[PDB]
Amino acid sequence: ITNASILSIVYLIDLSRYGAEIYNGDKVYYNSIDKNQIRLINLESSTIEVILKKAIVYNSMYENFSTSFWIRIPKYFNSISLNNEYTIINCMENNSGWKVSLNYGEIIWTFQDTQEIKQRVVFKYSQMINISDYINRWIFVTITNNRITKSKIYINGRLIDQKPISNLGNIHASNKIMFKLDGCRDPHRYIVIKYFNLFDKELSEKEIKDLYDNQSNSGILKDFWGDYLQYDKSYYMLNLYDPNKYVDVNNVGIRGYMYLKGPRDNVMTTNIYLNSSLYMGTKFIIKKYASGNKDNIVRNNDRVYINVVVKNKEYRLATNASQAGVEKILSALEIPDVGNLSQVVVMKSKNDQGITNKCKMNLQDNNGNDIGFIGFHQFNNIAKLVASNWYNRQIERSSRTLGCSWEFIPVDDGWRER
Ligand code: NI
């Protein structure tokens, strides 16, 4: 696969041996926390142009190739976006070549020969869904092309669609790849992209999985959207075991508790989307404690505190590890009164073998013994938040979703709630 790399863009430069030239328009935006994330908006000046050396300009009936990239597509919210295929990554020249385009709920690959014969492959996702894996969340796209079998589109390493392409003839693509919203009716539309790559082979399923795993940066925790999780940033909490609930606090202090309540409200716009509201419940803020890194990113194994916002004031998530029973009920404590109560949380994305898990917060007692991952337990019809080593034992056996599986959801411009 490294031998197969013919374009590999990072923050912008091409790391490949072909050293593509890259030109950015005046209205490209690079994310401050992760400069590899490039945002393109619906303006003529919001462009990236990549110029490929002659040696790798595609002009063949037979040569195989693949592309991979990550994309984050804001929720479609207005009818102007319905029935509107717009190009985003264009390598067509004189009506032959390849392009990536989007439409309402779609990511589309088009491959076109010099006789105007076209094949497409399409990933479809719904916006009428409780919780989506795709809307406004980072998606890893991979498209592979084998000239004597099929074009194939993979999403997060999984095969979605494939179509025969053996009837396509010579395909003569451009020496320029234009990253630009082209033909988009919605003035507010944008995309975010990262890690654009080309390969001079059809990638195997294993290669695709390994690319997904490696480019995921699994040593850094992620928020719900797939961005790096951060310190000093307000997050709404989603429990993946029961996504219809949200967190609330029934009194501050050590006799109070946090609990899960439901149902969530709907958010909807007729014939455009119907989802659960994400911006509900008690906000959590992760506080830097042990990390010596100067940046603001939360890494696997960082020891942190968790603050909880109650009536616009920060409290400390904590428990008395000496309480009866081994499901330790969590409370929201006044920060000056926490004392030596249990409050240090080990943040987790993956285990020592590299196996990822959505269980994020492993609470420690004051002696550094695990009290357990933070999840919930039902005490007489109330689902109270607890730390429990039951989770820790289960996470050693599988990576399935458990009650300790959480997402941290910050307010993001690609998911607007009324
Ligand atoms: Ni329990």
Cα of 125 vs centre of ligand 1, distance in Å, is 35
State whether 384 and 242 are in the same domain: yes
Task: Identify whether the C-beta of residue 234 lies closer than 8 Å to the C-beta of residue 314.
Answer: no
CA of 91 to the centre of ligand 1 (A): 55
In this structure, the answer to whether residues 28 and 53 fall within a common structural domain is yes
CATH number of residue 181's parent domain: 2.60.120.200
The token pair at 226 is 């797939």
The answer on 187 and 245 residing in a single domain is: no
How close is the Cα of 258 to the center of ligand 1, in Å? 15
Does one domain contain both 136 and 216? yes
- The one-letter code for the residue type at 135 is I
Residue that is last in its domain, among 205, 223, 241: 223
Q: How many whole angstroms from 183 Cα to the centroid of ligand 1?
A: 53
Q: What resolution in angstroms does the PDB record give?
A: 1.3
Alpha carbon dihedral 301, 302, 305, 306, in 10-degree steps, equals -70
Same-domain check for residues 69 and 126: yes
Q: Cβ–Cβ contacts within 10 Å for residue 358, how many?
A: 18
Cβ-proximal residues to 295 (8 Å cutoff; 6+ apart), any chain: 33
Between CA 375 and CA 319 the distance in angstroms is: 13
Domain of 68 in residue numbering reads as 1-223
Q: What is the dihedral of CA 19, 46, 134, 298, to 10 degrees?
A: 70
- Please report, to the nearest 10 degrees, the dihedral formed by the alpha carbons of residues 206, 144, 100, 417 taken in order: -20
d(CA 378, ligand 1 centre) in Å: 7
Same domain, 209 and 230: no
**Listing from the earlier edge strand, what are the strands of the sheet with 176-182?**
21-24, 48-51, 176-182, 86-93, 96-103, 106-112, 118-124
Q: State whether the Cα torsion 154-156-157-158 is positive or negative.
A: negative
The residue among 223, 248, 277 that closes a domain is: 223
The CA 185 to ligand 1 mean position distance, Å, reads 51
Residues 325 and 412 in one domain: yes
Q: Which residues contact 144 (CB under 8 A, 6 or more apart)?
A: 64, 66, 151, 152, 154, 202, 203, 208
Q: Is the domain of 260 the same as that of 184?
A: no
**Distance from residue 380's CA to the centre of ligand 1 (Å):** 12
The last residue of one of the domains, among 223, 240, 274, is 223
Give the method used. Answer: X-ray
With CA atoms as reference, report the closest residue to 173 among 140, 198, 148, 142: 198
Measured in angstroms, how far is the CA atom of residue 100 from the centroid of ligand 1?
47
Q: What is the 3-state secondary structure (H, E, C) of the chain?
A: CCCCEEEEEECCEECCCCCCEEEECCCCEECCCCCCCEEEECCCCCCEEEECCHHHCCEECCCCEEEEEEEECCCCCCHHHCCCCEEEEEEEECCEEEEEEEECCEEEEEEECCCCCEEEEEEECCCECCCCCCCCCCEEEEEEECCCCEEEEEECCEEEEEEECCCCCCEECCCEEEEEEECCCCCCCEEEEEEEEEECCCCCHHHHHHHHHHHCCCCECECCCCCECECCCEEEEEECCCCCCEEEEECCCCCCEEEEECCCCEEEECCCEEEECCCCCCEEEEEECCCCCCCCECECCCEEEEEEEECCEEEEEEECCCCCCCCEECEEECHHHCCCCECCEEECCECCCCCECCECEEEECCCCCEEEEEEEEEECCEEEEEEEHHHHHHHCCCCCCCCCEEEEECCCCCCCCC
Q: How far is the CA of 364 from the centre of ligand 1 (A)?
A: 18
| 184 and 327 co-located in one domain | no
Among the listed residues 284, 49, 299, the one whose alpha carbon sits nearest the alpha carbon of residue 176 = 49
Q: Ligand 1 centre from 263 Cα, in Å?
A: 21
Cα–ligand 1 centroid distance for 377 (angstroms): 4
Distance 391 CA to ligand 1 centre (A): 9
83 and 197, same domain (yes or no): yes
Give the count of domains, the chain: 2
166 lies in the same domain as 259: no
Residues 145 and 111: beta-carbon distance below 8 Å: yes
CATH of the domain at 389: 2.80.10.50
Q: How close is the Cα of 327 to the center of ligand 1, in Å? A: 6
Measure 282 CA to ligand 1 centroid, in angstroms.
22
Residue type, 396: E
Same domain, 351 and 362: yes
CA of 20 to the centre of ligand 1 (A): 56
Side-chain half-sphere of 80: how many Cα atoms within 13 Å? 10
- What does the alpha-carbon distance between residue 99 and residue 119 come to, in Å, rounded to a whole number? 11
* CB 164, CB 145: distance < 8 Å: no
Angle 178-181-187 (CA atoms, 0-180°, nearest 5)?
A: 155
Distance of alpha carbon 391 from alpha carbon 398, whole angstroms: 11
